[PDB]
Design a protein around this ligand. Structure first.
Ligand SMILES: CCCCCCCCCCCC(=O)OP(=O)(O)OC[C@H]1O[C@@H](n2cnc3c(N)ncnc32)[C@H](O)[C@@H]1O
Ligand SMILES: CCCCCCCCCCCC(=O)OP(=O)(O)OC[C@H]1O[C@@H](n2cnc3c(N)ncnc32)[C@H](O)[C@@H]1O
Ligand SMILES: [Mg+2]
Ligand SMILES: [Mg+2]
Lengths: 508, 508
């Protein structure tokens, strides 16, 4: 039986490999060995204790996505305090808003990114690191916390922001399931190097690093010196990383612009928005295993998973988000206002709003019982997302299918649009895709591959030429609403254009 | 030739009918005759002058939607100052945000709805009224302003708010067109009573009252004592009013709940969201003329209009928003990034993003040249809305047509859904409607008329019964996503269900 708190599971790794490096930035500064982490947690928690910060107290962790932030989280955990995750880049008014919601007892400021008015009334502690033996006095003193005790808070927006309270179990519930069931969808390897572009104030970022820390991994976060992702993954020789479809799309573009490969890369976790099947297939060709994750902050990150397997690329293109881990219960509410907690009807539908009952679910929105009671009922979380459980057992976030692009009410054949587009001089290859529209059904989006290498002006010139061509040759509604110059066009082995991969990339 | 500023046009009415009442609340307090308005404008402008408020200066008008607010606007106009419209109900952080954007020289506070930090550094003037001859010293002293000089600012949001700078011409450009062209789409009658539920910080509210003030009308605003609209319109015997589809829908419900009528009501102006053809037809049966208006804050309120006429209800149901006033130029950009200001292509399409060139258009977003240059180019405003100019000359904000409700990819017949629903015991009448969805094409929305009069519990009980019925009798995707108990179901004279009126009301 593993320890029941995040901090204890981390310290257990610190006992096995105390000299192993735990946290460091991309360049290498703010580096912490596991023994240095334990020592610094104790010191910072001692500094917090001098500011009336006790068990249950809330601490505003002004994040920098670096080692100092996750140190600050674990320092709060030592007191049994709650680490309120606040983005350092955000304007003062946002952070001032955060303080009013959470009413923190103190603030932990990690460098780096003129302070809010609320911080003038509360204690503020600066947290930074510089460049022995495993101290047993810092290993002792862990507050008697449990899996149900709150650890951190993550903010989520439609307009107004809410504070998602997360217990310790959120960060190990699913990993323990994968271990117990002997599943390989997402795996950790002790000592291996990982990187997170996702901020610590992001549910995906905070969750990922903590899971890696509890598995004794080398976690590289914060201190980005380059906009290049290919560089960081190869410079630091990472094995695993957590991405959003936009960032994975960026990486693939870099892996194409240069005949490149990240050999050290073993596993890629991706999610947050519409998956791009083209980018996933490309990186699986490299030999890297991937796993799509579906979830919310309210569900403690991942709840459904889509790991690398036969036919995976096919269903990801069809809009599959995956299927739940064993122990995570799912329910499709066909009618609004009638969930699984409603008496009578009924069994889960094959289509409807997704309700999730997971051991990683939130405790509830902080200081907001009214809204919490609309989303969290009897352990079930209303995701508010429409899903479809198809006849294969997978859940799809979009529906099938548009064979023609029906704009307004007129059926528009993609082959015709492609033909007209390809009839233009400067174009080598062209493919259109469907852009959904509530008012007009669908829109015509057009991806274009230029024969030559165009600058900013030549590309714009080609764009206006293609549009003027459609104005004359085609008719409404068969006129492209958007025309974009793309490096390449993803196709199946049958030669069929993967238009969903184009659409997903168009939004991202 | 009429005066070129709003203030001068108002004062001209104050010369014709100085004893006529200009502004008052719903109950009757804060009442101002036109001569009392002129006197109070001068005094308040004198009070502003003592706080370094000169021509071009910006004044934060903390609105209350009452007479004191519009007094404050006209007082700013006297100095040639800009009245920054700020909602009093909004939280401190919002108003603090407003001050940072506009950098005001002073603030005019009208009672009623703990002040922002920014107001501690700027002068603050309280403005309230209580209970002779037309003073010629207050009639004189109007700063030499023109139609192009800025008068007020209106804030608009996706997430972040922008300050829309509006010149004087915004408030009389279109009215002057209607007068010159001899059109009757929207008319004013001197002395008549008008009411505005829309706030002064709303573009529709501020615009409406100012137009009525310049036409010498009795303007009732602010100081709402009841939630009943039927009462206010009948108590104060108004002739005209400005509404949003939600409020018009509310009024109709009240006009049904009691066998009632607003006889004094002559004209109803409505717009802002999807028009409900059922509610419009109902109030036109009363004998009241209506006019739909399409526009943005960036276009100085209304730009297109749909007045009461033969076949109007038919096209409003089809999603028509109207057609431009003579002088207002429209352009449908078929492809994103290619507007009317783009060289080459082309003539206006019959489908695309609407660009509007109007004499009522904004001057630009305050202190934001970058975003202004993306929306306001050579006098054209990018509405960002997809419109379709059908073969009748009207512009439609939605497309035709869903004959079947295609959820996922399955064609679903409304007659079948209606039948299953009506087969339930407690239901007298039932009709479904299409709810557009980007991911699944469409959803099934269901409107239900109960045979008896149900309380809150009996209605919920009926709802769950109907849903459980569809779970068993029907199949996905033909299961209703939403089930609502409605008072009645709008039909044509042919008996056909006006399902768009149901959908529009469902969103509102
Ligand atoms: C290895 C694991 C870490 C690597 C991945 C880290 C990213 C995963 C963290 C996700 C949680 C998060 O971002 O917070 P939020 O509450 O905003 O998300 C919820 C909203 O987002 C959308 N959505 C999430 N999943 C999605 C997915 N699969 N397909 C498509 N839409 C997805 C949904 O529409 C939902 O409304
Ligand atoms: C007698 C005249 C006064 C009585 C009416 C007063 C209300 C009219 C004032 C409207 C201006 C306003 O509300 O500001 P905003 O910039 O938010 O509006 C712009 C947005 O709103 C939507 N939209 C406006 N018009 C609409 C209409 N006709 N159909 C459907 N959608 C309409 C559009 O989608 C647009 O994106
Ligand atoms: Mg997300
Ligand atoms: Mg609006």
């Amino acid at each position: 039986q593993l320890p029941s708190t995040v901090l204890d599971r981390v310290f257990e790794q610190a006992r096995q490999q105390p000299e192993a490096i735990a946290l460091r930035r991309c360049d290498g500064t703010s580096a912490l060995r596991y023994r240095e982490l334990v020592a610094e947690v104790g010191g910072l928690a001692a500094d917090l204790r001098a500011q009336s910060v006790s068990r249950g107290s809330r601490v505003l962790v002004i994040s920098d996505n670096g080692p100092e932030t996750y140190l600050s989280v674990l320092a709060c955990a030592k007191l049994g305090a709650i680490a309120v995750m606040a983005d350092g880049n955000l304007p003062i008014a946002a952070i001032e808003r955060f303080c009013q919601i959470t009413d923190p007892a103190a603030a932990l400021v990690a460098p780096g990114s003129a302070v809010p008015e609320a911080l003038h009334s509360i204690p503020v502690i600066a947290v930074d690191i510089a460049a022995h033996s495993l101290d047993a006095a810092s290993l002792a003193g862990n507050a008697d916390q449990g899996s149900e005790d709150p650890l951190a808070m993550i903010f989520t927006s439609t307009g107004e922001p809410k504070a998602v309270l997360l217990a310790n179990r959120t960060f190990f519930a699913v990993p323990d399931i994968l271990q117990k069931e002997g599943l390989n969808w997402v795996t950790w390897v002790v000592g291996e190097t990982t990187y997170s572009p996702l901020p610590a104030t992001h549910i995906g970022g905070l969750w990922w690093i903590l899971t890696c820390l509890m598995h004794g991994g080398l976690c590289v976060t914060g201190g980005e010196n380059t906009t290049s992702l290919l560089e960081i993954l190869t410079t630091n020789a990472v094995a695993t990383t957590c991405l959003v479809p936009t960032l994975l799309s960026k990486l693939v573009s870099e892996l194409k612009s240069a005949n490149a490969t990240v050999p050290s890369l073993r596993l890629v976790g991706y999610g947050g928005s519409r998956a791009i099947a083209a980018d996933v297939r490309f990186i699986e060709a490299t030999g890297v295993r991937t796993a799509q994750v579906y979830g919310l902050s309210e569900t403690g990150c991942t709840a459904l998973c889509l790991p690398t397997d036969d036919g995976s690329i096919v269903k990801i293109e069809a809009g599959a988000v995956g299927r739940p881990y064993p122990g995570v219960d799912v329910y499709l509410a066909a009618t609004d206002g009638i969930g699984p907690t409603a008496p009578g009807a009924g069994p889960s539908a094959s289509f409807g709003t997704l309700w999730i009952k997971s051991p990683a679910n939130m405790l509830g929105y902080w200081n907001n019982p009214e809204r919490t009671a609309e989303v969290l009922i009897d352990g079930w979380v209303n995701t508010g997302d429409l899903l479809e459980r198809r006849e294969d057992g997978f859940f799809y976030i979009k529906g099938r299918s548009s064979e023609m692009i029906i704009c307004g009410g007129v059926n528009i054949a993609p082959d015709e649009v492609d033909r007209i587009a390809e009839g233009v001089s400067g174009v080598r290859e062209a493919a259109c895709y469907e852009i959904p529209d509530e008012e007009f059904g669908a829109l015509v989006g057009l991806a274009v591959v230029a024969s030559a290498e165009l600058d900013e002006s030549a590309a714009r010139a080609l764009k206006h030429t293609i549009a003027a061509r459609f104005r004359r040759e085609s008719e409404p509604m068969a006129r492209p609403s958007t025309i974009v110059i793309v490096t390449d066009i993803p196709r199946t082995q049958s030669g069929k254009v993967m238009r969903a991969s184009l659409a997903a990339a168009a939004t991202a």
